[PDB]
């Protein structure tokens, strides 16, 4: 049994465990037979080309299906009266009721609406015709081919880079900062100024005329002579670079000329930043030299050894990358609703809900994975000798202080936050809603006031943003923060207080599980030699009291539940606060979010009505029938996860042995024999499969609920506003 | 001479697992899969470009045409099979002969199956109407 070829341990297994574990360990390239360090980095570099190519093929498919089956040009002519189309439906299982429910009014056939926001992205970038979308689709498929060729080419023996090339940290940082961040942002500022801003002006600039179309009438003469204010001046032609600040009151979105100036300003910062480190020209910083100098008296050896720790551990590098991506992904979610960039996207409420929820769940997975590879680092790559007394080894040295205080904060938050919700629920039940514990969120209102929100009893400490940000942006910023129908610093009250501490509970508890798993990854009192067993192993048996879920992998598994719970609390709160805004029901949110029955009744029960009426014996089907079916599907998958999570292996293995008996004794069927002996799934596999069903069922249920409740009850809104002075 | 066309790995795996080369098959089942593949696509040129392509019996005429082409091809293959004498198992005389029998059964069957799909493809969307 030669599959899997990378593991002769697995390949000689005569059971069905050979197939499952070959799949599960296929991308764990470090643990494969015959792997060297150099061949690992060469395989990764080419694998990363393949992943890049998949991203561009995915984007070209979205572009093709919107161009070929969508209604982009019909939507461009009428952005309020036209629902954007993702792709057509051809499903032979459809009856006549389903075909007409998905066929839009006057339409040719059944289609899916689009909630990815791609139309608003394509329109804001300046695309106006289907030929724009089709040429994007071809270009990304060609770009995908180039990366596939590059990955293949850099596996050829003349082009495989050396291990010293992959470990040249200083050159990679200089190139990724200056070109991959800086020049790419500079190029995007070029697209905005040459293409997207003239398209917003109504001037079609494309490849056929952009060489002979000045983006500014004075073109490039103010740039080189240092007279840069001409690009901001309305009397010297339409401006291309401004700092108005705030949101455009006609659109409710960011100023395009602000977006262009933003990407130009940060391009200069990133290009300058990528001149910091020492490559082959004598000048620049050695990263090892910077880290070794930063050694103070309280933190022992400081950062000495951390260069060779990070540069020789891919799991450390990946954990740092995942954590930073996860923070930035959350920041994308928080700033996309608060400061939207895309024309007609704040008016599409379903898209704003879908995008916030998508990116917060992605950020939650990236955060858990960052700590997972931090735990893998400690078992596989952490050398205590080369990290002697530095800041890394000192974390492990006071790890009982870290875990016990994280345990304290989570219990401190959890006892009182739950206690306050329960207090308010009992008050509402007994007819005493004026005896609720309603705590005013004055520390966060303090933050809003420092940015120029006018809130009566809360002081501007330094004197307000007139003192603290006296820039050119200040009039447009203050006009957008104090305006009605403006998403910047939403009004908050006691319901916002309680859920923010519930969120802080979920953040501290998920961190506690992840940090304890990463810090007890190498060993504990119950298992002092745990690093000799690895990241993922079932247990150490029933001795010493019993040791189920003792591995660092099992702490990942436990924290996924807590991450899903925390992001659930975050996205429930975003959705209910915004559908109360969109639905003109903010007073209901402020009244009912302070106790948990209000969340059950006014959020979950009330907004389930269009969803579960998506198909019915009385009224047939409508467009929500697919979300209604997915909503039930998600409940089924989630509940199926419970079977794997609760009923553990030895039950199933004894059950399978009777089935093995039955097959071998049944006439006409015992002539057919398995090649691999049926066994129950392993202990770790049962946890993983149970977590997978739990997670998939969690996400599909909420996505069906979030989309169908928003698209039926709160689909559209104005998003224009009157600025405040 | 050793060339990249002669030496690609998933090109070698594909050819090695075509039914003429696939390990563990009987020559009948080899011919059956080969015939089913060829008879399926062969009705396409006969039905769409044949002389009765614009009449309502164009698919039936293309079906009987394909069966005629497979029957004459089988005559060559069955005659080849009777005369080879050369090599063991798959290039046995009985081996090639079973392949010829399987090819014709699969070929006619592939054409009939492709006929039924082309004649009754409106049924795959008949639920909606």
């Amino acid at each position: 049994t030669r599959f899997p070829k990378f593991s002769q341990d697995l390949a000689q297994d005569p059971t069905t465990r050979r197939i499952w574990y070959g799949i599960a360990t296929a991308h764990d390239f470090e643990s494969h037979d015959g792997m060297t360090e150099e061949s690992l980095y060469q395989k990764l570099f080419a694998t990363h080309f393949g992943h890049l190519a998949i991203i561009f093929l995915w984007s070209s498919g979205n572009l093709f299906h919107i161009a070929w089956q969508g209604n982009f040009e019909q939507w461009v002519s009428n952005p309020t009266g036209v629902v954007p189309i993702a792709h057509a439906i051809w499903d032979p299982h459809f009856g006549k009721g389903a075909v007409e429910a998905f066929t839009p009014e006057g339409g040719a056939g059944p289609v899916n609406a689009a909630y990815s926001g791609l139309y608003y992205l394509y329109y804001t970038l300046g695309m106006r015709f289907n030929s724009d979308l089709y040429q994007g689709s071809i270009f990304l498929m060609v770009l995908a081919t180039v990366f596939l060729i590059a990955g293949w080419l850099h596996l050829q023996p003349r082009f495989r880079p050396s291990l010293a090339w992959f470990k040249n940290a200083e050159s990679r940082l200089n190139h990724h900062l200056s070109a991959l961040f800086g020049v790419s942002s500079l190029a995007f500022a070029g697209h905005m100024i040459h293409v997207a801003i003239p398209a917003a002006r109504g001037q079609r600039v494309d490849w056929s005329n952009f060489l002979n179309t000045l983006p500014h009438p004075a073109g490039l003469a103010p740039f080189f002579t240092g007279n840069w204010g001409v690009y901001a001046d309305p009397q010297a032609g339409p401006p291309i670079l401004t700092f108005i600040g705030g949101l455009n009151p006609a659109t409710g979105t960011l100023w395009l000329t602000d977006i262009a100036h933003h990407h130009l300003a940060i391009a200069v910062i990133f290009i300058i930043a990528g001149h910091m480190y020492r490559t082959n020209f004598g000048i620049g910083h050695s990263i090892k030299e910077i880290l070794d100098a930063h050694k103070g008296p309280l933190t022992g050896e400081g950062h000495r050894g951390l260069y060779d720790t990070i540069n020789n551990s891919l799991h450390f590098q990946l954990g740092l990358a995942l954590a930073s991506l996860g923070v930035v992904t959350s920041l994308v979610a928080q700033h996309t609703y608060a400061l939207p960039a895309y024309f007609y996207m704040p008016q599409d409420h379903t898209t704003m809900a879908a995008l916030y929820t998508h990116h917060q769940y992605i950020a939650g997975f990236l955060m858990v994975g960052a700590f997972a590879h931090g735990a893998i680092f400690f078992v596989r790559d952490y050398d205590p000798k080369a990290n002697e007394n530095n800041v890394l080894a000192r974390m492990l040295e006071h790890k009982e202080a870290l875990i016990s205080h994280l345990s304290w904060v989570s219990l401190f938050l959890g006892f009182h936050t739950l206690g306050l919700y329960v207090h308010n629920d009992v008050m509402l039940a007994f007819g005493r809603p004026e005896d609720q514990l309603l705590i005013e969120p004055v520390f966060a209102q303090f933050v809003q006031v420092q940015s120029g929100k006018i809130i009566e009893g809360i002081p501007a400490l330094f004197g307000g943003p007139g003192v603290t940000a006296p820039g050119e942006f200040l009039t447009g910023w203050l006009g957008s923060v104090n305006a009605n129908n403006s998403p910047i610093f939403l009004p908050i009250g006691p319901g916002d207080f309680l859920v923010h501490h519930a969120i802080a509970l979920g953040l501290h508890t998920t961190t506690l599980i992840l940090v304890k798993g990463a810090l007890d990854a190498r060993g504990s009192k119950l298992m002092p030699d745990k690093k000799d067993f690895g990241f993922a192993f079932p247990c150490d048996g029933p001795g010493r009291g019993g040791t189920c879920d003792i591995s660092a992998w099992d702490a990942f598994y436990l924290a996924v539940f807590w991450m899903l719970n925390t992001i659930g609390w975050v996205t429930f709160y975003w959705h209910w606060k915004w559908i109360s805004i969109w639905g003109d029901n903010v007073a209901q949110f402020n009244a009912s979010s302070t106790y948990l029955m209000g969340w059950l009744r006014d959020y979950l029960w009330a907004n389930s009505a269009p969803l579960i009426g998506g198909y019915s014996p009385s009224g047939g089907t409508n467009a929500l029938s697919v979300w209604a079916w997915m909503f039930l599907f998600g409940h089924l998958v989630w509940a199926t996860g419970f079977m794997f999570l609760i009923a553990w292996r030895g039950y199933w293995q004894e059950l399978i042995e009777t089935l093995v008996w039955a097959h071998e004794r049944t006439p006409l069927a015992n002539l057919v024999r398995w090649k691999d002996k049926p066994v129950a799934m392993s202990i770790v596999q049962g946890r993983l499969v149970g977590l997978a069903h739990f997670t998939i069922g969690y996400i599909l249920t909420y996505a069906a609920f979030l989309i169908a409740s928003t698209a039926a009850l709160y689909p559209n809104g104005p998003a224009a506003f009157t600025p405040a002075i | 001479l050793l060339t990249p066309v002669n030496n690609s790995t998933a090109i070698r795996w594909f050819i090695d697992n075509l039914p003429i080369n696939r390990v563990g098959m009987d020559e009948f089942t080899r011919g059956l899969e080969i015939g089913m593949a060829h008879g399926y696509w062969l009705i396409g040129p006969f039905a769409l470009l044949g002389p009765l392509r614009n009449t309502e019996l164009g698919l039936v005429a293309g079906l009987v045409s394909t069966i005629g082409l497979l029957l004459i091809s089988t005559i060559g293959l069955s005659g080849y099979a009777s005369l080879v004498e050369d090599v063991p198992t798959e290039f046995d005389r009985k081996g090639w002969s079973r392949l010829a029998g399987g090819f014709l059964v699969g070929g006619v069957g592939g054409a009939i199956f492709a006929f039924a799909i082309l004649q009754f493809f409106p049924l795959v969307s008949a639920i909606a109407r």
Partner: peptide, 29 residues
Amino acid sequence: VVSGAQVAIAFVVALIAGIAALLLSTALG
């Protein structure tokens, strides 16, 4: 619109990406 010629062109570009993916996936294995 996306005409029938442009659908056919897109599948030819997709076929070339397919053989490129085939080159990479066998060099990776």
